[model samples]
Target: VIKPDPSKYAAEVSTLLTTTWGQQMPYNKLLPKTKKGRLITGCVATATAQVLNYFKYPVRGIGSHTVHYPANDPSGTAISADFGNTTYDWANMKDNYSGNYTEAEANAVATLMLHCGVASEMQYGGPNEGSGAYMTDCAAGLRTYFGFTDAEYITRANYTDEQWMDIVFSELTKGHPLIYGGVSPGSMGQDAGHAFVIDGYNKAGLVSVNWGWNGDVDGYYKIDLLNPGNMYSFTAEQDMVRGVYG
Candidate 1:
């Protein structure tokens, strides 16, 4: 098993975010070949590999389509379909389960996959039938990949904003992906959308999230998931989630 040095990983993540910020504009936007995308993809792959590595598991970085279960399977499917009700379960894999995991285990999974590059299978939409389907499918994908039962993952019908954040931060600290519903500002209300990992929090309380090509905000940025000024912050209590990985 690879033993990860927490300080080392933390510094790496910090440096990636900082460098990306310098090279990119305000929100960390640059082409995939550019420094911004390089840092963004690096942090995400590292975070994903870190989680799987904690369990001493092996994974390949795969790319998938914009939609759930794309025809070509651009991204590699980490989890299987039997584990949950939805077609894909990205959020649950990172957030739900809790146990003693080593830093090496966590960083291994995150780094490996990130090195390979992972993409989301869903799109953005307001809270409705169309949006709900995308949310549930992604959640199921996470459950299946992590070998969790249907009950383990969150669904649009079941999860509250607070519970969703609980799951997100839990996995993030472990160096896993961060996937969750997207809510608009007060006038916009709730939207049935989802986004995936870009980066994670350091020793400081900054959450660096990565949005793929579609994201207006790409690359890593220092964010306060709770008190985000204009950014979308998850509505869960901070104490419920703490850093578990390096």
Candidate 2:
């Protein structure tokens, strides 16, 4: 498998976002509202495929709203019963992930999944609501498939965005995928969303997100990981909703 050059992809995404959306649009606005959304998703898929291509992994792109399924394994049996149940315990859910996967391996799993069609179904909110859990499930699957233990698979929580970005970049540099979720501060009535991968960042402190929208171009956006309110209106809520998996 050929490893990708993170800098090249990062620059590509940044240029695409800048050219299509205009410099004024915030990076978080990469959703499919205007023509840019279509371009963004396409770029995300392409970038995802590029990573997958390097690993020689075969993946299929599932729509963005893919339904959650119960696993035949006893560990996942409860998933079926809890499907769509808002009361399901998301916080207390133990890191049931397994498989001896490293961060790099997890990134590969995530990138492949994102490109293969998971990008179509990506959304915002908690898992039971169909957004947060997807990332959690994807990361867990990668961990289990690669034989990574739950602790090693799931990253430590409550990290600042800057810290999280560093962790994410380190893993991606090695070929693993990272899941991201957070709220948009300036927007009204929009909940948080989960993005598929973190391709790379630049000297300007902008991190590129390959969300499943806008033609697969790396959706570059500035993240003040230290200042929650820069991206989210409510800092506490931002922390509560923010989650990443590798």
| Per-candidate total of colliding backbone pairs | 37, 36
The TM-score of candidate 1 is: 0.34
**Candidate 1, 112-229: lDDT as tens digits:** 3322222223221211212122334433433334332331234334555445434544555445443333333344554322333434554444455543322335544443343234
TM-score of each candidate structure, all chains considered together: 0.34, 0.38
> What C-alpha lDDT values do all the predictions have?
0.32, 0.33
| Model 1 Cα shift for residue 169 (angstroms) | 5.0
Identify the leading candidate in terms of lDDT. 2
Please give me the total number of clashing residue pairs in predicted model 1. Answer: 37
Question: Which candidate leads the pack in TM-score?
Answer: 2
Model 2 has an lDDT value of 0.33
